[PDB]
Amino acid sequence: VKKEAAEKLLEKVPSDVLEMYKAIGGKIYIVDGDITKHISLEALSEDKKKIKD
Amino acid sequence: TPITMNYNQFLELEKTKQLRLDTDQVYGNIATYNFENGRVRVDTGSNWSEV
């Protein structure tokens, strides 16, 4: 009789395609602190306000 | 900026539903009568904290 030999049908593995999608990449955006300056006097005042006759 | 709450306080609030509010002190001014024109005018300098 003649031997099969068996060279196989399956080629490589999914693992390369699996690794392709497995890509995670970079996520999220900068927020919160930004720059922050601010300056004006809407908080408190100062002006002569007494009483007399 | 809005009020911030962390994680453990958030869990404790959603468990216990106990969130109370205290009034520590109140700022506020006096308006005084003017003998000049009768108009009662606010002194922004003076406050009821003095009084």
UniProtKB/Swiss-Prot annotation, chain A:
Subcellular location: Secreted; Host cytoplasm, Host cytosol
Domain of life of the native organism: Bacteria
Induction context: Positively transcriptionally regulated by AtxA, which, in turn, is induced by bicarbonate and high temperatures (37 degrees Celsius).
Subunit structure: Interacts (via ATLF domain 1) with the cleaved form of protective antigen (PA-63) anthrax toxin; interaction is required for LF translocation into the host cytoplasm. Interacts with PA-63 homooligomers (either homoheptamers or homooctamers): three molecules of LF bind the PA-63 homoheptamer to form the PA(7)LF(3) complex, in which the relative position of the N-terminal alpha-helices in the three LFs determines which factor is translocated first.
Domain notes: Lethal factor (LF) is composed of four domains: domain I contains the first ATLF domain that binds the membrane-translocating component protective antigen (PA); domains II, III and IV together create a long deep groove that holds the 16-residue N-terminal tail of MAPKK before cleavage. Domain IV contains the catalytic center.
Family as reported in the entry's similarity comment: Belongs to the peptidase M34 family.
Function: Lethal factor (LF), which constitutes one of the three proteins composing the anthrax toxin, is able to trigger rapid cell death in macrophages. Acts as a protease that cleaves the N-terminal of most dual specificity mitogen-activated protein kinase kinases (MAPKKs or MAP2Ks) (except for MAP2K5): cleavage invariably occurs within the N-terminal proline-rich region preceding the kinase domain, thus disrupting a sequence involved in directing specific protein-protein interactions necessary for the assembly of signaling complexes.
Name used for this protein in its record: Lethal factor
Organism of origin: Bacillus anthracis
Segment of the intact protein contained: 87 to 139 of 809
Curated annotation (Swiss-Prot), chain B:
Site (Alpha-clamp): F35
Cellular localisation: Host cell membrane; Host endosome membrane
Membrane topology label: Multi-pass membrane protein
Superkingdom field: Bacteria
UniProt remark on domains: To pass through this hydrophobic restriction, substrate proteins LF and EF need to be unfolded prior to translocation.
Function: Mature form that oligomerizes and forms a pore to translocate the enzymatic toxin components edema factor (EF) and lethal factor (LF) into the host cytosol. Following attachment to host cell receptors and cleavage by FURIN, homooligomerizes to form ring-shaped oligomers that are in a pre-pore conformation, and associates with EF and LF. Toxin-leaded complexes are then endocytosed in a clathrin-dependent process, followed by a conformational change of oligomerized PA-63 from the pre-pore to pore state, which is triggered by the low pH in the endosome.
Subunit structure: Homooligomer; homooligomerizes to form homoheptamers (PA-63(7)) or homooctamers (PA-63(8)). PA-63(7) or PA-63(8) form ring-shaped oligomers that are in a pre-pore conformation, which do not penetrate the host membrane. PA-63(8) displays an enhanced stability, suggesting that this form circulates in the blood to reach and exert toxicity even in distant tissues. Interacts with lethal factor (LF) and edema factor (EF); can bind LF and EF simultaneously and interaction takes place following homooligomerization on the host cell membrane.
Protein name: Protective antigen PA-63
Source organism: Bacillus anthracis
